[PDB]
Design an enzyme around this catalytic site. Structure first.
Site, PDB file in Angstrom:
ATOM      1  N   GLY A  65      62.258  23.216  51.875  1.00  0.00           N
ATOM      2  CA  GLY A  65      63.461  22.428  52.077  1.00  0.00           C
ATOM      3  C   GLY A  65      63.604  21.986  53.529  1.00  0.00           C
ATOM      4  N   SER A  94      55.985  24.184  51.575  1.00  0.00           N
ATOM      5  CA  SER A  94      56.754  23.554  52.642  1.00  0.00           C
ATOM      6  C   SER A  94      57.198  24.632  53.635  1.00  0.00           C
ATOM      7  CB  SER A  94      57.899  22.693  52.081  1.00  0.00           C
ATOM      8  OG  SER A  94      58.955  22.469  53.026  1.00  0.00           O
ATOM      9  N   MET A  95      58.471  24.636  54.058  1.00  0.00           N
ATOM     10  CA  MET A  95      58.939  25.603  55.038  1.00  0.00           C
ATOM     11  C   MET A  95      58.847  27.009  54.460  1.00  0.00           C
ATOM     12  SD  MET A  95      59.622  24.361  57.910  1.00  0.00           S
ATOM     13  CE  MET A  95      60.469  25.723  58.702  1.00  0.00           C
ATOM     14  N   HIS A 119      51.761  21.142  53.496  1.00  0.00           N
ATOM     15  CA  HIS A 119      51.681  19.692  53.567  1.00  0.00           C
ATOM     16  C   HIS A 119      52.442  19.233  54.811  1.00  0.00           C
ATOM     17  CE1 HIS A 119      55.456  18.943  50.792  1.00  0.00           C
ATOM     18  NE2 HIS A 119      55.649  19.913  51.663  1.00  0.00           N
ATOM     19  N   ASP A 168      49.159  17.147  50.125  1.00  0.00           N
ATOM     20  CA  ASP A 168      49.458  18.409  49.469  1.00  0.00           C
ATOM     21  C   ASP A 168      48.179  19.235  49.355  1.00  0.00           C
ATOM     22  OD1 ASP A 168      52.078  17.625  49.228  1.00  0.00           O
ATOM     23  OD2 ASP A 168      52.102  17.508  47.034  1.00  0.00           O
TER      24      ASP A 168
END
Ligand SMILES: CC[C@H](C)CNC(=O)N1CCC(=O)N2[C@@H]([C@@H](C)CC)C(=O)N(Cc3cccc4ccccc34)C[C@H]12
Ligand SMILES: CC[C@H](C)CNC(=O)N1CCC(=O)N2[C@@H]([C@@H](C)CC)C(=O)N(Cc3cccc4ccccc34)C[C@H]12
Ligand SMILES: CC[C@H](C)CNC(=O)N1CCC(=O)N2[C@@H]([C@@H](C)CC)C(=O)N(Cc3cccc4ccccc34)C[C@H]12
Ligand SMILES: CC[C@H](C)CNC(=O)N1CCC(=O)N2[C@@H]([C@@H](C)CC)C(=O)N(Cc3cccc4ccccc34)C[C@H]12
Ligand SMILES: CC[C@H](C)CNC(=O)N1CCC(=O)N2[C@@H]([C@@H](C)CC)C(=O)N(Cc3cccc4ccccc34)C[C@H]12
Ligand SMILES: CC[C@H](C)CNC(=O)N1CCC(=O)N2[C@@H]([C@@H](C)CC)C(=O)N(Cc3cccc4ccccc34)C[C@H]12
Ligand SMILES: CC[C@H](C)CNC(=O)N1CCC(=O)N2[C@@H]([C@@H](C)CC)C(=O)N(Cc3cccc4ccccc34)C[C@H]12
Ligand SMILES: CC[C@H](C)CNC(=O)N1CCC(=O)N2[C@@H]([C@@H](C)CC)C(=O)N(Cc3cccc4ccccc34)C[C@H]12
Ligand SMILES: CC[C@H](C)CNC(=O)N1CCC(=O)N2[C@@H]([C@@H](C)CC)C(=O)N(Cc3cccc4ccccc34)C[C@H]12
Ligand SMILES: [Mg+2]
Ligand SMILES: [Mg+2]
Ligand SMILES: [Mg+2]
Ligand SMILES: [Mg+2]
Ligand SMILES: [Mg+2]
Ligand SMILES: [Mg+2]
Ligand SMILES: [Mg+2]
Ligand SMILES: [Mg+2]
Ligand SMILES: [Mg+2]
Lengths: 189, 184, 191, 184, 182, 185, 190, 191, 180
Positions: A65, A94-95, A119, A168
């Site tokens: 997010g 992600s994070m 990514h 990705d």
């Protein structure tokens, strides 16, 4: 529903997540926004005040997010004295995977069938050319920032991180280990 | 779910409040302002000597709601420290700079953004004009206080706030928006 | 409204929601679509029950059409990690990752009631964008399918080839068919 | 608002204490899991005493219904079934699933039997698979209704081809219930 | 929304004195609640009267019948007091109160009419639905007749279209026994 | 809609086919389509009351009353109206196919013919449901009777066979009596 | 906007929209999804062209993702019924009933251009309602599938068994591959 | 409103919409998204123009952001099939299959005006459903890309390796850059 | 649209007058490109008149028109009536030198190109570089066309900039204000 648990100096009733927090376990099991970040920062700070020596356990099952909200957590992790272990279960993307990488050295884990994805940051901008430019430089600087820390934390060059995050990139727990995002795959007791 | 903590049983935020920590962790609207005002007023009453801690992870929001907090910070006796974690943008970065002098902080990777106030108006030219002057005055007011709080000139604040301006923690320090980057 | 249950304790009357009352006796209910929230809840319950008693069995009730593969693996890995045997009991139906978890119970302790329905098929997903992006998504879901199938093979004793033919399209099994396939050990018969 | 009764209980929880379970909605997986849990709990409290399942339901998911059905048949206690208002779809199936001799309906209760509903879109092969599935499901339902009512599979099939509304007395004659509960 | 009285919510407090509030549209939830209340009061005391307040536009016929049958089944007399209005299955249940103990307050409105429904699909399915609602109407009309004293013929004329009645009109019709006076 | 030129009057393809006594029923049957076809019939009769008319049918059907507008007009006019089912004829589509001149009702080999019962709806008071139920039931008897007359099948058999959707090949439609002949290459 | 085209005839000038101009030369354009309207237009065009001249070839251009099976068979049957040879020319793509109609062209006169794409798959559909209605729909689309597959067997020379394997899922073919499959006779070269 | 133009012929006055007036002089306008309708229209024009005159050049104006790949190939294949040289002239922009068709013009007769913009990237698509369905969609779009890239290679003189690198993401080119890339032969300079 | 014994716009087009009286999209560009090419073929010597009452629109669409104006032999006069904004005012400036006009109360507006970008950082970057290059291109030509410097154009277009007809003249966007 969230189940309730009861222990039996009196009888105290806990929601299951609170009960885990009492044993220094923090659940990051959702998309990372400002609310999730505030909750987790608060939890980290509270656990430190209770005991600045004992390890903390950050469970990560999260698609990721907000980058800034993720950094609110990241910086709180680095600031407090206790080692914060990270445990990937399900996925970290992600994070989410950035935070997994941010755990105390030697204490970043994923269970065998957990999935790790890295990514490049996503964003958006509309308006005047000059506004597009500002937004561009901002997300580019943010990526440099992310990639620099990943490099420090994984041992990989910034050049390589840049390549491997261009699109990705799905990794097994095992692959995440050899990449340096985690230290160990947790094998069955 | 907001976790519970048993020491008396507290939600985690209320437990932090007992140690004089206020969390500004959302968009600034009227409700957030009334809550934060109420917490500042209460902590002063409990103890008018001890520092208060205001965590800021906020993209900002309503300017009048922001000033509700600002004025309450300045009015009360205790020093209100400010700690930027994550980001402070718009009135978020304003309130960060409004902390007690020498006690404004940001953790290393926190992001601070300054820019001009945003608004809208529709109707007759005369109504447009009224709304234009209103938001122009509001900016002068904001810039004037930032000037006082950062040590930068109104001239420089005007230029630097003209468009979105994203700063690192270290950059917010040399700008005067904070005093110190909290290190590990 | 989830019903409340009240017992008589010597230090007053303790009141439970019915699911929480079952969890006191080491019963976990997976009775919904599997998403991350349901997975976090079940992981939490599993870890707690282990802390309470590392030797007594746990009972995972399954009535689930399935859901997120990764959320499912959260549960799967937690089950495999903890000391206690986790029994699985299919009641109603178990499709998608539902039937996966059913098969993931402790060896000899996977059950279905006689009219419960088990369904196996291949994973579902999507992709849009550039060809390169479609290619990455395709490889991803194909690997995920290899992963699932490889475990089902180990768990059921069927060959990977057979798992792939049999999951190519929706495949509904009776409890007794689930048993001969190796997804469960036993059809629970009335007491 | 669900009323409270004073041990302070919501009314349904109060009834649950006397081994009464209320199926008074559409049957979905949630309703199924709640009722399964209640059954399992009551058995644990006392494996000898009867349970009472009140049924006022238009029915719903077949698999969910079979979650309840299998649980009723697995546990030691006789589960009485009592149709009040209406039972339709799996609602009337579960009514028929009560303990032999302890299936009831009040005089004006309505009972409806009909074939299962569903859908399928996609390739012909997928339609085929879906069609075999709902047909097998129907076979399964009709075979158990046959065992429970004393009627033939052939007759169930014809009598469920379309919506079939029954009075309580008709439902007794059909073998769906054992008795019409007359007033005290 | 709901005040507290000392602790009880106001409705729970009334329930302790054997008052049940039907103050909404009748659906399966309302019926289950009321049926549960009726059952519970009976268990507490099979002798003492129960008071059922009705301010309802009605709703589901089958749900109404869940309440009705439960009323008739239990030992206690269930009084019915119409306050505000009683329409559709609302006014049906008013009439289903214990004989001699069916009340409305002076300005309370009572409305009777024929049941409503829908059907779409094949002619055969329209036929099934039509027969179903027609049978449902005869059932209701037969029970109203028994309860009011009016003939089935007259019930059907009077319910053919929306028929609003004053409390005093409801009394001479047989839907209630008595207008409650100050 | 393509245009063709004859030697120079310029027609849309459908208007050119109408000059040669071909009417195209190639859509859902509503009041608009019925009025158009009614008008095409009435005109073609007026032009020449002896010559055949050809009614192409590729239609899922639609309004019953609209369908009868076409039917009563077909039966009313002197000319024989051939019916040709191409692609599919369902609902009142197949009813009109069957209503062609005796001996002159056709389908091409892979055309599909479906028969089923009429569809409708009703909401409101019991009494209104009743009125709508009787209405659709009568409409079905009326349709069935006429199919019986046109196919040679009994009313009893029509009712069993239309109780649910019933899909027929052209060859099956011929042995049912809905068409006389399958047109061959 | 569809372009207009004007010629000098002997008997004055004649103005045509481009598609009508091509129709004058016995060219039909199937360049869209196949529904009833498209089917009725093409059938009407086929009928007209045969009435103009029963001997001369007709050219059917196919750039279509397919669509309705029955609407497709409307076209198919009309093609087989009329005296003239209907050549089929795949330009761009032919999928579903589009490629079915491509294979339905006159033997030795089914073509695609080199980069045209042909796709074959099983029919698609849907059903909701009672078990009994799901059954009816299922039988209906399975029969339809046999029907399509049988004719494809006849038209291509492939076995029904093979047609069914090869249409089980979306199957994209190059023009060259469509030729070896028997869906077309020839790849038109520059 | 498309404007109308009227000329004086010997069989009275003939009235053309402006696009039709250009078509009379063998000018085809590709000035919109490429969908199936646009492709059918342009194919028809090409075929018509060939029949009128198999020898004289055709002019294809391209101001298009591109669109359907198959639609684009309908036009492309028609261009290569007919006897006449089809000149291409980029005005405004050519992107996606727009720039593919620009490159597809007769050799030595592909042009852009000085401020026209040419963009090349990879094909875009989507897929949902079972893994096996995603795989089929992935292979399809990957093959489609190989096809596009191979023809661009032939048409421009660049290698397939380079075309793939240079199309990986959106790649905007000036007219002059398009010329040195081999997408066009010449930049049209003012008269 | 009124008829004249031709529709009014077509009547004007017979006298070499083209109307750009709407937002500029690809359709409007194709039309205007076509009219220009036609008018050239009819007579390569006689002036063309382009009426501009447009808020502008697509930049590439506008450049379609721009390039076609510059390519053909005829002088294309530009006459701004009502307003010209975005690529509207760019095209006004693109008229033949000495033959660019505006009526007295006509409004001319210059500002920077608008746009959007979402996705990965790298995609935002490409879009940003693209719109920035596009602005450099517009500004360079405006410079050539007005006599003003690139640096001046840049600052003058940073935000919405409304000009009177007279101001447009002294800026160099037009040559003359048309008087009664
Ligand atoms: C349950 C008891 C309670 C948590 C213990 N008290 C406590 O941790 N306090 C108050 C007293 C105090 O001196 N500090 C200090 C330090 C002791 C922080 C470790 C402080 O700066 N903060 C600000 C703050 C505010 C908010 C978030 C934060 C994140 C990360 C660094 C700081 C942060 C709060 C801190
Ligand atoms: C938990 C105990 C309680 C907080 C102690 N009481 C208290 O602080 N009070 C009441 C008695 C009193 O004389 N005052 C005074 C002063 C002592 C304010 C500190 C007062 O003005 N207000 C008004 C007020 C109202 C609302 C917000 C506010 C913000 C900022 C300045 C004022 C404000 C409230 C103040
Ligand atoms: C009711 C009290 C409490 C649950 C007992 N304590 C406990 O389970 N803890 C803390 C102490 C500890 O050393 N551990 C360890 C092991 C003892 C895990 C069994 C640990 O790795 N975790 C991380 C973790 C975090 C989250 C989920 C998880 C799933 C599955 C493997 C790990 C996981 C938490 C674990
Ligand atoms: C209030 C106390 C508590 C409910 C009594 N304990 C209990 O019922 N348990 C635990 C111990 C145990 O041995 N069992 C066993 C049997 C005693 C089940 C009656 C068991 O199989 N399960 C699995 C299960 C799980 C879920 C649903 C179910 C439905 C129907 C058959 C089983 C099911 C749970 C069962
Ligand atoms: C607060 C304590 C509790 C309410 C007293 N117990 C009780 O009423 N019980 C249990 C024991 C029992 O033998 N019975 C019996 C009778 C005593 C009913 C009065 C019974 O039939 N039921 C079924 C039932 C079930 C549901 C709805 C109902 C409606 C209307 C007729 C029955 C119904 C439940 C009944
Ligand atoms: C191309 C010329 C024109 C159509 C020939 N005229 C004509 O057919 N007419 C007028 C004169 C006339 O006497 N009649 C008569 C009869 C000659 C009908 C054949 C008539 O009843 N109608 C009414 C009518 C009206 C509408 C639809 C219809 C359908 C079906 C039966 C009638 C209908 C119209 C009819
Ligand atoms: C441009 C003038 C006109 C097309 C020439 N006339 C003509 O083709 N006609 C009328 C005279 C006639 O005897 N026939 C006959 C045959 C000559 C059909 C080839 C006929 O059956 N139909 C019915 C029909 C109707 C509709 C579609 C159709 C498709 C395919 C088979 C038939 C079809 C129409 C056919
Ligand atoms: C205004 C007069 C008219 C256009 C001249 N006639 C003509 O071009 N014809 C008919 C006679 C004929 O033999 N041919 C042949 C060739 C002459 C095509 C150049 C043919 O294959 N087609 C099929 C076709 C169909 C559709 C699109 C197409 C694209 C590209 C290749 C073919 C295509 C049509 C072609
Ligand atoms: C109604 C009569 C007709 C307009 C006169 N013919 C004509 O102008 N032609 C054909 C013959 C020819 O040699 N040319 C040439 C030049 C004469 C263009 C001025 C040509 O390049 N094009 C391409 C083109 C295509 C489209 C737009 C355009 C814009 C601007 C430069 C070119 C453009 C078409 C041009
Ligand atoms: Mg630390
Ligand atoms: Mg202060
Ligand atoms: Mg285990
Ligand atoms: Mg039992
Ligand atoms: Mg009673
Ligand atoms: Mg006739
Ligand atoms: Mg033929
Ligand atoms: Mg060529
Ligand atoms: Mg010029």
């Amino acid at each position: 529903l969230i189940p309730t648990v009861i222990e039996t100096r009196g009888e105290r009733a806990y929601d299951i997540y609170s009960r885990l927090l009492k044993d220094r376990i923090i659940m990051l099991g959702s998309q990372i926004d400002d609310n999730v970040a505030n909750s987790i920062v608060s939890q980290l700070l509270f656990l430190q005040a209770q005991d600045s020596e004992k390890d903390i356990y950050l469970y990560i099952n999260s698609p990721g997010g907000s980058v800034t909200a993720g950094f609110a957590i990241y910086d709180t992790i680095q600031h407090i004295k206790p080692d914060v272990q990270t445990i990937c279960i399900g996925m970290a993307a992600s994070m989410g995977s950035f935070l997994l990488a941010a755990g105390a050295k030697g204490k970043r884990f994923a269970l065998p069938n957990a999935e790790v994805m890295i990514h490049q940051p996503l964003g958006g901008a509309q308006g005047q050319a000059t506004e597009i430019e500002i937004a561009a430089n901002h997300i580019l600087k943010t990526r440099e920032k992310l990639n620099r820390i990943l490099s420090e934390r994984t041992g990989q060059s910034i050049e390589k991180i840049q390549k491997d995050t261009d699109r990705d990139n799905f990794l097994t727990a095992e692959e995440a280990k050899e990449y340096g995002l985690i230290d160990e795959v947790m094998v069955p007791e």
